[PDB]
Amino acid sequence: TPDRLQQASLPLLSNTNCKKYWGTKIKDAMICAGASGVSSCMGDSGGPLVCKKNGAWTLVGIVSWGSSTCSTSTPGVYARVTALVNWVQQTLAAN
Amino acid sequence: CGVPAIQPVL
Amino acid sequence: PGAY
């Protein structure tokens, strides 16, 4: 929908606290963020959730799913990249 | 990686 | 919820 690229700052939540919103839907390979007055939305899926580590932006989450209405008071759910990185390296390595 | 030529502004 |  917007033409120009948007961005937003938002904090990371724990799975445990994430579970207060989403219950059992929150799995290990997921990471929640947001619930801060901002929200990822339809169309953002697949995009990055980056964090600065030792001065370089690092891929921490992949936009996955969240509230149907993009509620800014509910956390968005991203794929947890640390949990999936071994898979990425194996695929790169073999391909 | 992770060091953009043009700096993000937050 | 919903996919994004």
């Binding site: 948007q6 390979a29 992949i62 | - | -």
Partner: protein
Amino acid sequence: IVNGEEAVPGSWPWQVSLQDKTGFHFCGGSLINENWVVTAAHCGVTTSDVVVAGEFDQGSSSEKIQKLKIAKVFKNSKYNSLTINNDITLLKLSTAASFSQTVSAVCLPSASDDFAAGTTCVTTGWGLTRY
């Protein structure tokens, strides 16, 4: 993104857009190198879609974007469509992205990385700004 803000153009050089043959932008992705893009499994990418790199404004006819074809789709295969768990796919490009000021890679973490609750991160995209 709802309640986000416009980014400084080209400041997130690893962000790409996934577009179908009709030109509709359906998902985002991140360049992890010149030859591979990471995106979500549930985006359901096929090799008939295109990866757009270097783009800021989707309106634009004068931007120097790169339109890259996809050679192979690699959906993680612990991907669980019922739960959307393990939602990651790798896209192997047919032609390499040409790295420039506006096109570059995001780093990947160690499996061992710690990203604490409370940490302020960034998410970018062309998704809905309002529902």
